[PDB]
Amino acid sequence: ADRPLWSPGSEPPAWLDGSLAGDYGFDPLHLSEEPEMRKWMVQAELVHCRWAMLGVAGILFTSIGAKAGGNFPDWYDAGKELQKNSDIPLGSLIFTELLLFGWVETKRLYDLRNPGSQGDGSFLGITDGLKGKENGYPGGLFDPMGMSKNEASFKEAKQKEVKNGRLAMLAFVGFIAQHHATHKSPIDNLLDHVADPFHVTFATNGVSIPH
Amino acid sequence: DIAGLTPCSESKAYNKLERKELKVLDKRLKQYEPGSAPYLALQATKERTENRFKTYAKQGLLCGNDGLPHLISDPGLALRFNHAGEVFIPTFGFLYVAGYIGHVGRQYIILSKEDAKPTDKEIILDVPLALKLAFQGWAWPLASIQELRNGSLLEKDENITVS
Amino acid sequence: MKDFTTYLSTAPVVGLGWAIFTSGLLIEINRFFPDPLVFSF
Amino acid sequence: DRPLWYPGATPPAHLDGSMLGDYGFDPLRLGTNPDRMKWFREAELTNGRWAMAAVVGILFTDVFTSIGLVGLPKWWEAGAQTYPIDNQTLRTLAIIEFLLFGWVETKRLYDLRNPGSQGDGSFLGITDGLKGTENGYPGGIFDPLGYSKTSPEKLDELQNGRLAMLAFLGFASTAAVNGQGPIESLQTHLADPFHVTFATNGVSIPHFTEF
Amino acid sequence: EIGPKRGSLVKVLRPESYWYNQVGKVVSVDQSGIRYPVVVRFENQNYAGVSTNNYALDEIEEVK
Ligand SMILES: CC(/C=C/C=C(C)/C=C/[C@@]12O[C@]1(C)C[C@@H](O)CC2(C)C)=C\C=C\C=C(C)\C=C\C=C(C)\C=C\[C@@]12O[C@]1(C)C[C@@H](O)CC2(C)C
Ligand SMILES: C[As](C)(=O)[O-]
Ligand SMILES: C[As](C)(=O)[O-]
């Protein structure tokens, strides 16, 4: 009786009311019920959003470049033809990626178990920065612009990145579903639908056609 | 030359057995077209069968009058030759894994003897404790020998006997 | 959720999770590595 | 205690006590018992001190070989060059090694057992100098360079010994799969840093990089 | 005043007893006077499923 819910009239869960950004009381499988699993899942969803947004942005920009005339492959089968004629071998690229990501994902991990553990100044004497402002929102060094030093603006600005990330990760499932059917770029599926709405789904393989 | 056995490449019976197996495979391989699935399955089977017979004959493993391989299990005959892998290192690998397992299980069952109603912990395990101990036992030879010199594994004759 | 995680310490867990891990590991080792009967050296 | 191995939130249990090169690294809890810790300390000392005098024979001797000043062989066959030599003290080497070591290793053993316990008339007139100040740190050996107050330079020795043990482990792992020597691998890796990498030699998966 | 302090754990030396050489707390040392005054209580069951038993004072001994 204080916030919009996902199902109008249903009783919101008793383990989440208004503290988390993007809270609508949607949890039917009783997940993140304990404080620790919720502290885990919050930052898990946050990282999912922060990767889905970058992925969808890159995909859409490369697709618009390809449709406009740029030398850009589509989002699918792009790691196959960018590796054939590249100076950096596969494997030597994968383990470079994993070596650079382990060192940062580990520091991201142990700031979840004990916040502020990274701001002791052992890494290049960085003390003020590298200190977890909240569960999954660090600051100081990752926030060069003073755009989170006000709760009135921050509680309202963080409640929209979760929505944009949820929408972006729903769009990423659209990218996959929208490829196994048409085998065309995501921007191509758009222009083939605005120019003629009659070319809507349920026309190629969405529904079974034995008759 | 040991035990009257001969290296397994010079065994006419071994090659005769390989040819027999290949003929038996091909006689029913010729039943299907080269495009269907069963044909590819038989092709891959023949692939790894030829691979069986080729890869064995390296570094030396003795086959007898029957042409089949025969494992040498004596240390000393696996030495002075090249047979230390027949069964000499597998022994140490199993000893390592069995140690690992027993060490972890013992330290678990000991650390549970302190809390109230340990029987419950034997039907409702402590999954995180078991996972922790599972990723700490791969130094058990070090811990075992020095825990033996320690004396924390000998019970000072305080158990139930009848005689 | 809590009672479910507690239930997940019995026969329907390791003893299933275990021995499923082990069957999978052994089958994968015998699949990628087709037919071992002696060590490399 | 000097900086911790994990920068953030990993509490040590029994490594709060003072000791040389202590960064709180003991994940498997192998040094809980103080007597076994006291033994493993000398273990490190003897391993590190031995690997440093070994890697120098592999590093400082092969740097001149690559430059072309000297024609010494690589270490993975320096052992095979010896006995074919004309004046070759054949392999009565190993057993005389064992004898000459044993006689000293037993003295060090009994000194660790009864620290600084050398009889008065046991060794001709040099019994006096054989008493060691501490375990693994004897007096009579270093002529200069020990009478300072800043005796905690042992940190340098321990860090260099650990680095040299890693060096020799890397030497043995390289000269086994790369086929070449350490200096040669380093030079090829500076020549082309993206192709000569452990990913191409050592791991079985990336060998299937079929586009 | 006769037997060990109540709440203090003690072992058993009855040669024919399921519980032998292992420790068990005392319920109440019978002060009224009887040949088997010490009533010891054990958590683990026996072949019959009984948890407690009374023993003589010449049989029980000190702690580990
Ligand atoms: C689908 C998804 C989330 C779905 C979540 C669901 C259903 C959860 C449902 C519930 O839990 C709730 C909420 C509440 C619970 O009580 C009940 C249930 C019902 C359990 C997220 C996807 C999230 C997906 C993400 C973040 C994907 C990222 C993709 C990236 C980064 C792409 C990068 C590349 O595109 C480039 C740049 C170049 C290309 O060549 C290569 C690639 C790799 C394609
Ligand atoms: C110093 As000790 C207990 O290993 O003999
Ligand atoms: C495996 As090798 C380099 O010793 O032949």
Neighbours of D37 (CB within 10 A): 16
- Burial of A75: CB neighbours in 10 Å, binned 0-12, 13-18, 19+: buried
Helix (H) or strand (E) holding D66, with range, is helix D62-67
Q: Which domain holds residue C39?
A: 1-41
Pairing mode of beta strands E23-26, E9-11: antiparallel
Q: Report the distance separating Cα C25 and Cα C19, nearest Å.
A: 9
Whether residue C35 contacts residue B51, with contact meaning beta carbons closer than 8 Å, is answered with yes
Neighbours of D8 (CB within 10 A): 23
Q: How far is the CA of D174 from the centre of ligand 3 (A)?
A: 11
Q: Report the distance separating Cα A186 and Cα A175, nearest Å.
A: 6
Query: The tokens of D115 are what?
Result: 């620290």
Whether residue B112 contacts residue B118, with contact meaning beta carbons closer than 8 Å, is answered with yes
Q: Do D29 and B150 touch (CB under 8 A)?
A: no
Whether residue A206 contacts residue A181, with contact meaning beta carbons closer than 8 Å, is answered with yes
Nearest to D195 among A80, A92, A118 (CB): A92
3-state secondary structure of A22: coil
A169 lines ligand 1 (CB under 6 A): yes
CATH number of the D34-208 domain: 1.10.3460.10
In CATH, what number is assigned to the domain containing residue B115? 1.10.8.110
Q: How far is the CA of A172 from the centre of ligand 1 (A)?
A: 7
The C-alpha of D115 sits at a distance from chain B's nearest C-alpha, in angstroms, of 20
Nearest to D36 among B136, B138, B146 (CB): B146
Q: Report the distance separating Cα D21 and Cα D199, nearest Å.
A: 32
Ligand 1 atom index nearest CA of A173: 1
Closest-CA residue to A96 (of A85, A108, A105, A88):
A88
Which residue shows structure tokens 């501490």?
D134
Residue E13 Cα distances to B162, E3, E26, E40, angstroms? 11, 15, 14, 12
b/e burial code for range A111-143 (CB count within 10 A of at least 16 → b):
bbeebebbbbeeeeeeeeebbbbebbbbbbeee
| DSSP of A152-201 | HHHHHHHHHHHHHHHHHHHHHHHHHHHHHTT-S-HHHHHHHHHS-TTS-S
Resolution to one decimal, Å:
3.4
Residue D39: its chain B contacts at CB < 8 A? Answer: 146
Domain count for chain B, please give it.
1
Q: Which domain holds residue B27?
A: 1-163
Query: The tokens of D22 are what?
Result: 């202590």
In CATH, what number is assigned to the domain containing residue C17? 1.20.5.510
Which residue shows structure tokens 């430059």?
D67
| Residues 6 through 45 of chain D touching chain A, CB cutoff 8 Å | 6-10
Phi-psi map region of A101: left, alpha, beta (phi>0 left; psi -120 to 50 alpha): alpha
A57 lines ligand 1 (CB under 6 A): no
Domain count for chain C, please give it.
1
- The DSSP call for residue B4 is G
| DSSP of B48-81 | HHHHHHHHHSSS--EE-TTSSB-----TTTSTTT
Whether residue B104 contacts residue C14, with contact meaning beta carbons closer than 8 Å, is answered with no
Residue B7, beta-bridge partner list: B62
Q: Report the distance separating Cα A67 and Cα D82, nearest Å.
A: 70
Q: How far is the CA of D112 from the centre of ligand 2 (A)?
A: 9
Give all domains of chain E, ordered by start, each with its CATH number: 1-64 (2.30.30.50)
Whether residue E40 contacts residue E55, with contact meaning beta carbons closer than 8 Å, is answered with yes
